[PDB]
Amino acid sequence: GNVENLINGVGELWNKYVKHEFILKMRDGSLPLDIFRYYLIQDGKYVEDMLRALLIASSKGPIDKVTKILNLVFSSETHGKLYSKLDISRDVIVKTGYNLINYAYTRHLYYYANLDWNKFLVAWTPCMFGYSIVGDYVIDSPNEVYKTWASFYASTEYKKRIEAILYALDEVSITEDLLNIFINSVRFEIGFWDASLRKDPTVY
Amino acid sequence: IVGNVENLINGVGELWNKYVKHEFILKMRDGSLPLDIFRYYLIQDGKYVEDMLRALLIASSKGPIDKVTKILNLVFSSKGLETHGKLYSKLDISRDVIVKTGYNLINYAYTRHLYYYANLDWNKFLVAWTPCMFGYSIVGDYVIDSPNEVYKTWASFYASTEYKKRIEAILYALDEVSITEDLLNIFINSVRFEIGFWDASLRKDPTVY
């Protein structure tokens, strides 16, 4: 549908994202644990900002569509197990700075959330939908930590969240401007993985 | 009632009982409120609640993550929709009626008041939102004893343990706020709007906004 239309418009960037070196290494088990822990800390900062941006954006969306999404997002383990195992506390996430890509990406989500639901929704789709695909691929990893991580994104509960997002996305008339926002989010995802592999300075 | 909510309530003086013991509420409790007036009210409340939720979403983006997540989990869970669905059927109110009916002036102003503070600050919004949420908890506990089936049904949502849990989460967040006279003045304005909201329903004010 619209997500296929958007993915086709990014060309080679999509595979650069969903088949990134970082992910290939999680799948084969060769990703170093320190690179994954670094990543999880940055993701911990990102997810909180992503949620705040969703809250602002959802205030501007169709009531039926946003209510369905929020019911699944604010519903009521995987990350708690990983965080304790990798010695990542709340204080670690809060006190670690953002790397430059993470800082830029989170500010990109806030920019569109503050303007328009459709723009935010298109900006948010690569992270949500892409992680569904990555989860399905990484779930077959021989490394237990990486299978546990992937299990959250491969779960039926996560697929239900994605279904609700795509239902909202299918109401949007995709334009060149919206494709360009989607392209930028995909570029930030590729950069997010690159920064983790390099363990970039967390000074922002 | 203790802490911030007690101090805010005491700070509004006589306005508190003008709200929670309003004529509209007394007539729900004795069952004498005409159903046409209650229908008018429910339609305005249907408009209000959607704007209140939108304002909550904007405001919550600015709040402490633990406090806001606790509240949102309760607000976006899956008796409120079921209770209101039954009332909407009994009183012949559709989604179309809610959307197509205009706001009365007081509802228009009240909703714009919530948006104003939501666009500025979590603490200001939270204080502005407390009279509606906390006051309806009090009113529901009173009106549940009505001999009227429609009013008892309406009250049962606000008297329910699930609604009380929502109030507890709101009060946990409110306890983090350092209350100032400026914040008390926001709370007072919300209480004035609640009084006006019931006034406007008794009169069936023009729904032109």
From TrEMBL, chain B:
Residues 14-203 form the Thiaminase-2/PQQC domain. It holds the Pfam family TENA_THI-4. SUPFAM superfamilies: Heme oxygenase-like. One of its GO terms (cellular component) is cytosol. InterPro entries: Haem_Oase-like_multi-hlx, Thiaminase-2/PQQC, Thiamine_Salvage_TenA. It comes from Saccharolobus solfataricus (strain ATCC 35092 / DSM 1617 / JCM 11322 / P2). This is Transcriptional activator (TenA-1). It comes from the Archaea. Transmembrane segments: none annotated.
